[PDB]
Structure 1
């Protein structure tokens, strides 16, 4: 069976790789899709790439977004999706 924690880890790895990818040179669109779907912007583990996404308009316009930028970041949202608490 697919295990919850395993798939969560895989998806946060996937997201982290698109964030890294979007900063250079499909990654921008995957990053924007994650941010808009999960209502987050970046990762507490990747502060510089998060600065890049805010500087490049790759985050959703919610002041709720900014107030929970790192308090409820895309790793937490991915965990919440797989836990049924998003």
Structure 2
């Protein structure tokens, strides 16, 4: 089966959103938090939007990339944007 770039990007974001929501709402969600932490470290982001990345960095900072200050989350791309960069070949860096 052929894979469409836009559709796969949408599914990944959706998967990540499910994970983020579980990691934040509920502690002890060990695997959601692991998935979220892996996405955040790999893509260098901390949220589905600028606003959720800021919120996560203030309230659940352990989920954010190491050495991440709060205020960078205001200016850095969010995880949805980094997922788009990945599949379009823009570059995560």
Structure 2 length-normalised TM: 0.73
User: Residues 84 and 39 (structure 1 numbering): CA distance in 2 closer, same or farther, change over 3 Å?
Assistant: same
Unmatched segments (≥5 aa) in structure 2:
none
Aligned-pair RMSD on alpha carbons? 3.0
Deviations 1:12-60 (A, max 9, x none): 0000000011123910000000000111111217628943785241001
Aligned residues: 85
Structure scoring higher RCO (CA < 8 A, sep ≥ 6) equals 1
Give the structure with higher Rg (CA).
2
Gaps of 5+ in 1: none
Structure 1 length-normalised TM: 0.78
